[PDB]
Design an enzyme around this catalytic site. Structure first.
Site, PDB file in Angstrom:
ATOM      1  N   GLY A  14       0.829  -1.223   0.000  1.00 12.09           N
ATOM      2  CA  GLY A  14       0.000   0.000   0.000  1.00 12.09           C
ATOM      3  C   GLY A  14       0.853   1.258   0.000  1.00 12.09           C
ATOM      4  O   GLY A  14       1.832   1.306   0.776  1.00 12.09           O
ATOM      5  N   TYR A  18      -1.317   8.766   3.399  1.00 14.63           N
ATOM      6  CA  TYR A  18      -1.038   8.284   4.779  1.00 14.63           C
ATOM      7  C   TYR A  18       0.448   7.907   4.922  1.00 14.63           C
ATOM      8  O   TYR A  18       0.964   7.929   6.053  1.00 14.63           O
ATOM      9  CB  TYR A  18      -1.956   7.099   5.108  1.00 14.63           C
ATOM     10  CG  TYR A  18      -1.769   5.892   4.213  1.00 14.63           C
ATOM     11  CD1 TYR A  18      -0.801   4.936   4.477  1.00 14.63           C
ATOM     12  CD2 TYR A  18      -2.546   5.708   3.078  1.00 14.63           C
ATOM     13  CE1 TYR A  18      -0.616   3.837   3.652  1.00 14.63           C
ATOM     14  CE2 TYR A  18      -2.373   4.616   2.240  1.00 14.63           C
ATOM     15  CZ  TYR A  18      -1.407   3.669   2.529  1.00 14.63           C
ATOM     16  OH  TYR A  18      -1.230   2.591   1.705  1.00 14.63           O
ATOM     17  N   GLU A  20       2.880   4.593   3.614  1.00 16.61           N
ATOM     18  CA  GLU A  20       3.104   3.281   2.959  1.00 16.61           C
ATOM     19  C   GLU A  20       2.910   2.153   3.968  1.00 16.61           C
ATOM     20  O   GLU A  20       3.283   2.335   5.121  1.00 16.61           O
ATOM     21  CB  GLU A  20       4.531   3.195   2.422  1.00 16.61           C
ATOM     22  CG  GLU A  20       4.753   4.046   1.191  1.00 16.61           C
ATOM     23  CD  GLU A  20       6.135   3.942   0.584  1.00 16.61           C
ATOM     24  OE1 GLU A  20       6.925   3.121   1.060  1.00 16.61           O
ATOM     25  OE2 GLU A  20       6.406   4.689  -0.364  1.00 16.61           O
ATOM     26  N   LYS A  34       3.601   0.137   8.797  1.00 17.45           N
ATOM     27  CA  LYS A  34       3.129   1.445   8.286  1.00 17.45           C
ATOM     28  C   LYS A  34       4.197   2.503   8.577  1.00 17.45           C
ATOM     29  O   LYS A  34       4.545   2.702   9.745  1.00 17.45           O
ATOM     30  CB  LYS A  34       1.822   1.871   8.952  1.00 17.45           C
ATOM     31  CG  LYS A  34       1.211   3.119   8.339  1.00 17.45           C
ATOM     32  CD  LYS A  34      -0.226   3.345   8.742  1.00 17.45           C
ATOM     33  CE  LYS A  34      -0.729   4.701   8.303  1.00 17.45           C
ATOM     34  NZ  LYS A  34      -2.133   4.884   8.713  1.00 17.45           N
ATOM     35  N   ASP A 135     -13.058   6.592  11.200  1.00 17.86           N
ATOM     36  CA  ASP A 135     -12.578   6.421   9.797  1.00 17.86           C
ATOM     37  C   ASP A 135     -12.908   5.023   9.274  1.00 17.86           C
ATOM     38  O   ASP A 135     -12.128   4.461   8.492  1.00 17.86           O
ATOM     39  CB  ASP A 135     -11.105   6.791   9.667  1.00 17.86           C
ATOM     40  CG  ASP A 135     -10.670   7.007   8.231  1.00 17.86           C
ATOM     41  OD1 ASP A 135     -11.541   7.353   7.385  1.00 17.86           O
ATOM     42  OD2 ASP A 135      -9.495   6.711   7.952  1.00 17.86           O
TER      43      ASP A 135
END
Ligand SMILES: COc1cc(-c2cncc(-c3ccc(C4CCN(C)CC4)cc3)c2C)cc(OC)c1OC
Ligand SMILES: COc1cc(-c2cncc(-c3ccc(C4CCN(C)CC4)cc3)c2C)cc(OC)c1OC
Ligand SMILES: COc1cc(-c2cncc(-c3ccc(C4CCN(C)CC4)cc3)c2C)cc(OC)c1OC
EC number: 2.7.11.30
Length: 284
Positions: A14, A18, A20, A34, A135
């Site tokens: 991903g 935000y 990766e 992350k 979220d």
């Protein structure tokens, strides 16, 4: 004693605003890493303070491993390390895969279990504050091999505006949300849960029929909709996702349609609780 802190980054699963997410290895074990962008640095701080306050452990909440701040050469690296779910997001899974009664109900009940756990205050040293996610969306849900899901991304979470515009509740879009009232943020979670329910139900086969994967409001807003695009649809016109006729020939989809309607009331206090949804889904 040696502290084995070497994490091997293997493949990026991903990239986004935000930062990766990477599939990594720590001591043979698969981990998700992350790396926050400077733009999202407040989400690392907020999530680290949450976990420093309450160490969440639930089968339907993405499993926390570590928060790391490193000094790079001129800059600060912020890392979040969690358990790794090879099947990926619910968003990804629904694109290619269809569901049957059993797999559909397993998915939506696990999400409701996770969300109920976030929402509930448990008293005692072993307890937890009530948490609103703020979220919730199909990209923030991961599929496990046992057919249950787990809720991810507590970067915006509040303990007792912001989020993805496509999943924003009307009282957020028209800025009427009672900002001082914690129940307001639970109600925003139920709204978004209703939309995810809709995204999952579409992919459940009944009578040889299924719908293709579509995100909420795919038929009334463009990609990357503006605040104003969402406000007009959800607040001014009070539109809600279509329930297809074919769902009314299936008992499960008929029950799921009723539930998503009870998530989608313009009046936030009229919406079902996570606990009421968990019960209704268990009865289905
Ligand atoms: C620092 O950084 C990371 C470290 C580790 C890691 C690796 N080996 C051992 C440890 C460890 C844990 C806990 C204790 C306890 C023993 C009992 N005593 C009463 C208190 C202390 C000791 C050692 C850790 C924490 C993993 C990480 O991520 C997967 C780390 O993040 C990069
Ligand atoms: C962060 O994550 C992981 C950490 C570890 C790990 C490595 N060394 C030591 C520890 C440890 C030992 C003992 C205690 C307790 C027991 C006694 N009590 C009275 C004090 C504290 C706590 C911690 C751990 C937990 C392994 C992992 O997986 C194989 C981890 O996950 C990837
Ligand atoms: C949403 O939020 C977070 C999620 C995760 C996370 C945990 N397990 C697995 C994943 C993942 C793996 C693989 C795919 C795809 C990519 C390739 N394609 C071929 C199908 C598979 C997608 C997703 C993720 C993204 C970790 C996080 O933090 C460390 C997250 O942030 C809190």
């Amino acid at each position: 004693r040696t502290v084995a802190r070497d994490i091997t980054l293997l493949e990026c699963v991903g990239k986004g605003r935000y930062g990766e997410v990477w599939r990594g290895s720590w001591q043979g074990e698969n981990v998700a890493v992350k790396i926050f962008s400077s733009r999202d640095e407040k989400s690392w701080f907020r999530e680290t303070e949450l976990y420093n306050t309450v160490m969440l452990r639930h089968e339907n909440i993405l499993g926390f491993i570590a928060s790391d701040m490193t000094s790079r050469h001129s800059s600060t690296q912020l890392w979040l390390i969690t358990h790794y779910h090879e099947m990926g997001s619910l968003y990804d899974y629904l694109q290619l895969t269809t569901l049957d009664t059993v797999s559909c109900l397993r998915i939506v009940l696990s999400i409701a279990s996770g969300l109920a756990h976030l929402h509930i205050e448990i008293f005692g040293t072993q307890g937890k504050p009530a948490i609103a996610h703020r979220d919730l969306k199909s990209k923030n849900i991961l599929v496990k091999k046992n057919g249950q899901c787990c809720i991810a991304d507590l970067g915006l979470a509040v303990m007792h505006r912001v989020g993805t515009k496509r999943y924003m509740a009307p009282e957020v879009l028209d800025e009427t949300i009672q900002v001082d009232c914690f129940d307001s943020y639970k109600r925003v979670d139920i709204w978004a849960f209703g939309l995810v329910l809709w995204e999952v139900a579409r992919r459940m086969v009944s009578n040889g029929i299924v719908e293709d994967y579509k995100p909420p409001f795919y038929d009334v807003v463009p990609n990357d909709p503006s605040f104003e695009d969402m406000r007009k649809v959800v607040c001014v016109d009070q539109q809600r996702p279509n329930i297809p006729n074919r769902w009314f020939s299936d008992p499960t989809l008929t029950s799921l349609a009723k539930l998503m309607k009870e998530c989608w009331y313009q009046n936030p206090s009229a919406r079902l609780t996570a606990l009421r949804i968990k019960k209704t889904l268990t009865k289905i």
